[PDB]
Design an enzyme around this catalytic site. Sequence first.
Site, mmCIF file in Angstrom:
data_model
loop_
_atom_site.group_PDB
_atom_site.id
_atom_site.type_symbol
_atom_site.label_atom_id
_atom_site.label_comp_id
_atom_site.label_asym_id
_atom_site.label_seq_id
_atom_site.Cartn_x
_atom_site.Cartn_y
_atom_site.Cartn_z
ATOM 1 N N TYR A 180 48.567 -12.199 48.838
ATOM 2 C CA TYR A 180 47.321 -12.076 49.563
ATOM 3 C C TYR A 180 46.248 -12.648 48.591
ATOM 4 O O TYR A 180 45.805 -13.787 48.752
ATOM 5 C CB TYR A 180 47.094 -10.597 49.890
ATOM 6 C CG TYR A 180 45.787 -10.239 50.565
ATOM 7 C CD1 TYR A 180 45.583 -8.951 51.078
ATOM 8 C CD2 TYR A 180 44.756 -11.191 50.719
ATOM 9 C CE1 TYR A 180 44.384 -8.600 51.681
ATOM 10 C CE2 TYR A 180 43.566 -10.852 51.329
ATOM 11 C CZ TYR A 180 43.382 -9.566 51.807
ATOM 12 O OH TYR A 180 42.187 -9.250 52.414
ATOM 13 N N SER A 238 46.927 -16.023 55.842
ATOM 14 C CA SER A 238 45.447 -15.966 55.713
ATOM 15 C C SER A 238 44.989 -16.378 54.333
ATOM 16 O O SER A 238 45.247 -17.510 53.922
ATOM 17 C CB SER A 238 44.887 -14.579 56.100
ATOM 18 O OG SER A 238 45.526 -14.070 57.259
ATOM 19 N N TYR A 239 44.321 -15.478 53.605
ATOM 20 C CA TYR A 239 43.909 -15.775 52.226
ATOM 21 C C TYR A 239 45.137 -16.122 51.383
ATOM 22 O O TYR A 239 45.090 -17.025 50.548
ATOM 23 C CB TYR A 239 43.123 -14.612 51.592
ATOM 24 C CG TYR A 239 42.276 -15.060 50.427
ATOM 25 C CD1 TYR A 239 40.897 -15.250 50.566
ATOM 26 C CD2 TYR A 239 42.863 -15.353 49.189
ATOM 27 C CE1 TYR A 239 40.114 -15.701 49.483
ATOM 28 C CE2 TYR A 239 42.103 -15.798 48.115
ATOM 29 C CZ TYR A 239 40.732 -15.964 48.260
ATOM 30 O OH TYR A 239 40.007 -16.418 47.178
ATOM 31 N N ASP A 289 44.280 -19.748 67.320
ATOM 32 C CA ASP A 289 43.737 -18.920 66.248
ATOM 33 C C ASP A 289 42.212 -19.071 66.246
ATOM 34 O O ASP A 289 41.656 -20.132 65.905
ATOM 35 C CB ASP A 289 44.345 -19.366 64.914
ATOM 36 C CG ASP A 289 44.123 -18.373 63.779
ATOM 37 O OD1 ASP A 289 44.967 -18.338 62.851
ATOM 38 O OD2 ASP A 289 43.113 -17.637 63.785
ATOM 39 N N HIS A 315 45.668 -15.594 65.182
ATOM 40 C CA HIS A 315 45.861 -15.318 63.767
ATOM 41 C C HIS A 315 47.036 -14.391 63.454
ATOM 42 O O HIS A 315 47.612 -14.463 62.371
ATOM 43 C CB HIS A 315 44.583 -14.752 63.127
ATOM 44 C CG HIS A 315 44.556 -14.897 61.642
ATOM 45 N ND1 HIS A 315 44.626 -16.122 61.018
ATOM 46 C CD2 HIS A 315 44.490 -13.975 60.656
ATOM 47 C CE1 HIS A 315 44.597 -15.952 59.711
ATOM 48 N NE2 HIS A 315 44.511 -14.660 59.463
HETATM 49 C C1 LIG Z 1 45.763 -11.175 54.372
HETATM 50 N N1 LIG Z 1 44.471 -10.699 54.909
HETATM 51 C C2 LIG Z 1 44.401 -9.569 55.648
HETATM 52 O O1 LIG Z 1 45.404 -8.875 55.892
HETATM 53 C C3 LIG Z 1 43.192 -9.138 56.155
HETATM 54 C C4 LIG Z 1 42.047 -9.897 55.880
HETATM 55 N N2 LIG Z 1 40.828 -9.297 56.280
HETATM 56 C C5 LIG Z 1 39.844 -8.847 55.287
HETATM 57 C C6 LIG Z 1 38.415 -8.971 55.769
HETATM 58 C C7 LIG Z 1 38.208 -8.342 57.141
HETATM 59 C C8 LIG Z 1 39.168 -8.917 58.171
HETATM 60 N N3 LIG Z 1 38.782 -10.311 58.515
HETATM 61 C C9 LIG Z 1 40.620 -8.831 57.674
HETATM 62 N N4 LIG Z 1 42.146 -11.048 55.141
HETATM 63 C C10 LIG Z 1 40.955 -11.884 54.829
HETATM 64 C C11 LIG Z 1 41.019 -13.319 55.359
HETATM 65 C C12 LIG Z 1 40.668 -14.341 54.474
HETATM 66 C C13 LIG Z 1 40.676 -15.685 54.858
HETATM 67 C C14 LIG Z 1 41.061 -16.016 56.162
HETATM 68 C C15 LIG Z 1 41.400 -15.001 57.073
HETATM 69 C C16 LIG Z 1 41.377 -13.649 56.689
HETATM 70 C C17 LIG Z 1 41.701 -12.752 57.582
HETATM 71 N N5 LIG Z 1 41.978 -11.957 58.400
HETATM 72 C C18 LIG Z 1 43.351 -11.427 54.660
HETATM 73 O O2 LIG Z 1 43.453 -12.472 53.977
#
Ligand SMILES: Cn1c(=O)cc(N2CCC[C@@H](N)C2)n(Cc2ccccc2C#N)c1=O
Lengths: 733, 727
Positions: B508, B591-592, B669, B701
Amino acid sequence: HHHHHSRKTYTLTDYLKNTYRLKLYSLRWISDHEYLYKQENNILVFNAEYGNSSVFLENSTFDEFGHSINDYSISPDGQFILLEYNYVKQWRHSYTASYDIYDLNKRQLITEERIPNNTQWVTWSPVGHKLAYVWNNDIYVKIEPNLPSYRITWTGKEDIIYNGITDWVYEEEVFSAYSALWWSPNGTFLAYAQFNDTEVPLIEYSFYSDESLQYPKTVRVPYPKAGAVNPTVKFFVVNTDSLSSVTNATSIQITAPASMLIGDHYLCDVTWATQERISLQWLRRIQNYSVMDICDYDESSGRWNCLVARQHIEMSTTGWVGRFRPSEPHFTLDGNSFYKIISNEEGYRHICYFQIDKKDCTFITKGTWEVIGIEALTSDYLYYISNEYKGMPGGRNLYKIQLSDYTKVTCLSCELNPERCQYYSVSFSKEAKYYQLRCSGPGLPLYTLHSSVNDKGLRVLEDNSALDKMLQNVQMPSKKLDFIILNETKFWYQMILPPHFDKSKKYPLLLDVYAGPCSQKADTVFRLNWATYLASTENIIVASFDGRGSGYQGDKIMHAINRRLGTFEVEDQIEAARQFSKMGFVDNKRIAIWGWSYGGYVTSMVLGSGSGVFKCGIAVAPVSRWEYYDSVYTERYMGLPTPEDNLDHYRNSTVMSRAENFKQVEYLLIHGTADDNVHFQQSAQISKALVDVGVDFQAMWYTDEDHGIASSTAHQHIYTHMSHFIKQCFSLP
Amino acid sequence: RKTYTLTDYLKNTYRLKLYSLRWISDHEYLYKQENNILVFNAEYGNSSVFLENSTFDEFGHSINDYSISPDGQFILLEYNYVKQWRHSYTASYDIYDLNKRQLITEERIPNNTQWVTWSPVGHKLAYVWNNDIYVKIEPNLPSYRITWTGKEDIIYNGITDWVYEEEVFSAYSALWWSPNGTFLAYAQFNDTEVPLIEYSFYSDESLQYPKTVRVPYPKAGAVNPTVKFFVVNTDSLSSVTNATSIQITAPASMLIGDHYLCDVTWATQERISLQWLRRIQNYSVMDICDYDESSGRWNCLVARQHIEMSTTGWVGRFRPSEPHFTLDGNSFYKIISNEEGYRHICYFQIDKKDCTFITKGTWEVIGIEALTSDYLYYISNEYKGMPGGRNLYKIQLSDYTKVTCLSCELNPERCQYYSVSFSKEAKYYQLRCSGPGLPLYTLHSSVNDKGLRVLEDNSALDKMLQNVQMPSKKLDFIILNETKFWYQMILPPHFDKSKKYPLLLDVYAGPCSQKADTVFRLNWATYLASTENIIVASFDGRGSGYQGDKIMHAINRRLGTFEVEDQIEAARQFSKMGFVDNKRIAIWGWSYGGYVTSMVLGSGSGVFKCGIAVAPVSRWEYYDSVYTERYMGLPTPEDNLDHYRNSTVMSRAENFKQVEYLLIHGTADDNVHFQQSAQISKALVDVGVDFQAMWYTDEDHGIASSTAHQHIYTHMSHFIKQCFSLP
Ligand SMILES: Cn1c(=O)cc(N2CCC[C@@H](N)C2)n(Cc2ccccc2C#N)c1=O
Ligand SMILES: *[C@@H]1O[C@H](CO)[C@@H](O[C@@H]2O[C@H](CO)[C@@H](O)[C@H](O)[C@H]2NC(C)=O)[C@H](O)[C@H]1NC(C)=O
Ligand SMILES: Cn1c(=O)cc(N2CCC[C@@H](N)C2)n(Cc2ccccc2C#N)c1=O
């Protein structure tokens, strides 16, 4: 100690980096005795008789221009050159560009009243130096290069009203061109089609562009899918000689015949007959019925008159009309008669000779072969390409028939180089006194010049000896072109065979498929392609088969899949592989299939058939269901997807319904995201169906690539990617 | 002697039993015993069928969810559920009269209702429909329309827009009832000039022409939604006159530029607290606003503004923490980072700037869970100095040094990760232990902190897992530059340290992420370790959370740097461990984690053979403003444009020649736009890099359709197995 044996193969890098280059000889006839050709970026003019050339225009002329010139165009009278720059591609044929005019006599750029940027089409009159161009969907005419334009149309509207240019489907499927402007022989009249897309639905798709674009763009294109509302068309003719700077131009409408106006219809052919006579062909949306109008200019009226007694009807009981559209007429000089390819009583396409006032034509050719195209017409001879020679549907030779005696036919290309040359096309001079022959195979390409006077060869233009020289110690593949008998019918196939081919061995086989209506994949043409690499380097036989639905062998074969795409053609590719394996040199366990476009559809339908014959396959930009594809192509073969017409088979012939059967094969599915032709949608629906029945497959999208996946980098990437997939499916290391 | 297979994971062969309760009062809670709804007495542990399975046999619709009014007189039934974004959905609603045993049929909640909420006491109902707010005082009486400005994609009353839903409130609702339900507070979002992400939606095969979905979505440095805040008195609503909504304006320090509303918390019946965040998220202000009777207005004294700011980063973990007010509402407790950069509970008086920290140490408070007159209950990772452990503590308000760990010693071996659910007045609490053993749910009474009973011990699963060769977990740390960094490994059954195992790094590594923890999980990693004998490791480097700001803020303004390097270094450290095959190290994340995976694979380190990025960010300008700018600032020449340009996966395309890449993305997405992967693939094509790809049609997503979920994991498994030469 190699002993000068060929140990080189034709590799993938050879294909991708274009190591072995086919030389062309591209000329443009300007007169009945001279042509133009690019030597070292110099434009050389050539005297066809003597062979002597002078520099017509040096490469060191438009260096000061400050722009990169994409193309050029010289006025028929040789007085002006049109320089085309800022080229931006739209669809297959359409693009916009900037244009400058250079005075070939004053030796200066025209700086007054320049053709605007973003011009959609530009065309010289056939004589002199009148210009017609389309800008912002409207037609303009310049009588002189440096003079103000006359605006012909005031109605052009982006994505809605197209004057002098085709919309998406007409470009792709009707005219195979963006141009919808037709000058009369001496440039008196300018005829044009006007297209109307007001209620045509839009295909919408994302375009991501350079990574600097923060938000993707949505491209929106008026695109009629099967059964959707089609563009409408009007036809006009304007007299360019009676133009005025103080009064708007009068375009005389030529309305479609009543037989056409009762339903949806198309304009499928425009052909000027004389200075004052034009022929129009119209097509019903159900494309088994077309009407040729023949329209004369009334002097006193200033109007155009299509006598119903000069209407000619072309229809089919077995299929659609023409190969992809009704063929074009070739008028005699007086315009009182014409020659046209139509299918005969036996279903074979031949030259029929029509008087303008008579229903029944007489066929001037016949036989269990087909005339491909009428190439030239003089007062004594008609020149045409056909596949008659040696009864090989995949060969092409030029013949001439004596107009006064049809038993007097001479083949002009047949015996020139029988072993090297079995596939010819032709370029005739302005009044057919000379012709360039272009032979495409089975040997290396060969370009020659001829005087039609006594059909003697004048000179070898290009014999590709430099490539011949390079290939001496390359282990190149060979081609086998032959037939199999199935239900007492000949069906042609070709095999690209690895070097040192041994029938004792079992080779992996790739079926390279198109199998669309009027397709031909077995021919005598020499190709340097991906198949060449696979045979030469990877020892794979790459075979293609022309089964039911394939062209150039009569309507009995061609019309066999009428109203029935996704059936016999798919079935015949599978049967081909059975036959191929039965020949004893094929590995039953390593048989693959691939295709692009229609061939992607057939590949997908074969892989989903459950036949058990094929181990793997690659569909590139395939159709997945016919309702997704454009109306004019699709309805030609399928009719309408309505309950009263052909919806049942529209629904029975989707690849999605075969998803379950993909559990048996390895599948690679490839699609460019910006494909305006077969929409990414089509493969997106395949993928979703495969996910929904839980079948694993390979996929590759190509960001911003269209139907051609033709960007230099994307072309290399897809073929590299497919090569790995095939090598892996075949256990090749 | 069987292993835990991919099919086991995909088909949920081995379920983790939950014990989900919803407290109804200070000693009662509801439990859904399959078909039934039971009321449980927390005192005695006995149950009566509160609502039968076949009560709504005659309904004719499929009930998605229920919701009892606080007074228990009415039950809200929810059906026609249509998911929107992560939290947002649409539904139809019926109200059932529990006193009468019949559906209300007059003045019903409309179809396509965006949000419904009962008032905190009684049975008033607020709901949002077509972006406007309606209130029902009685369930069968006409609803009073509060707002008349709601407009699809443009004006949002009482519901959030895309970015506030995903990144600010983690919720669709933007409605906040006062404790006794007199007042309804709400936010109003305005997306008028917010640009739209547009993408294709292919839908069912029967759709001839794809649909373009268009969503107001601010990418980094774009025009943001604006926010307004209102409070309406629901007791003086008239059927003759329009509702009067009193605006509370953001502080002057917020109105100077772009800002966000980041928290809403009622203190008392007539005091509401608002937190506002500047667009540059290192500065926030809490407003304390009081109702004035002679005014009818809300007053937020400037001398009552509490500033929370940061010199090393952004404010809060993902946003400034919520305050927990005392009963009178004259004081509150909230988590803020102390002077050492560790997040701890500070106690504020409403009228003063200085707070006193009531907790201290090199560990962090995760959340305040309840406050009573005598105790403050919180969860933290203090126990045994393990940032990935979670325990419940109580701090004696009359004496801060008197801290009792309530969960630490309950079952120290099975249980190191606790969450908690307190009753209405904190008389009881349910403890949820998520690991390292099988989850354990227990009921306790707060008066003596004794255990009432085991609610669910997961013995049914234990008996099943007896037969399967299950992987173990190692949670430990390595030292990098005199600093502990925590990692976990999912180790294959019968793990032999003299043997070399392929390793997959599960990443992550986003800001405040924590992938090394004491939680028991049955997942993809479980199958890979159990069936494929692959070690799956996760590592918490710089940027990771719950260890103080020195670690978390390390990547401030510098995304795609230190957290990328730290995954690489972690893998170097795992190879020095002697049981890792250095020829078979892979990396993956969603994601990240897709971003970091891609960044690691394009780094040219030579450490990784292969990897999989799922729905990765590829460059920060493509991602939403709220999340992105928090860490990256603005993509402008005068702020952080240079690092925005430096931190893209596209710029690393050439180094992908050294690795095997699988790039995966759902086409619908709305969060990480397909665009992001489409730009990666184009860049890899442009430099002649062969890689593997997969689009998922119409998936978002989560790629969470039953069929897509199964397909992606099957596809990734073949890729990893092929990378690792596993037959
Ligand atoms: C793995 N993971 C997760 O499991 C949850 C995340 N988040 C953390 C910030 C609040 C929500 N957007 C959920 N994030 C942040 C994120 C960074 C870059 C691109 C997309 C996302 C998303 N959903 C995340 O990376
Ligand atoms: C919510 O949606 C359903 C379906 O649209 C509505 O039920 C229909 O109401 C219409 C009124 O025109 C009737 O013709 C049908 O008999 C009903 N069909 C079904 C499926 O029940 C319903 O009334 C809507 N509104 C509410 C608040 O219930
Ligand atoms: C392989 N191949 C070709 O090489 C050329 C084709 N055509 C034939 C009809 C006229 C043009 N659209 C080009 N077609 C027809 C086609 C069928 C289904 C979907 C797309 C296309 C396309 N372009 C074709 O399949």
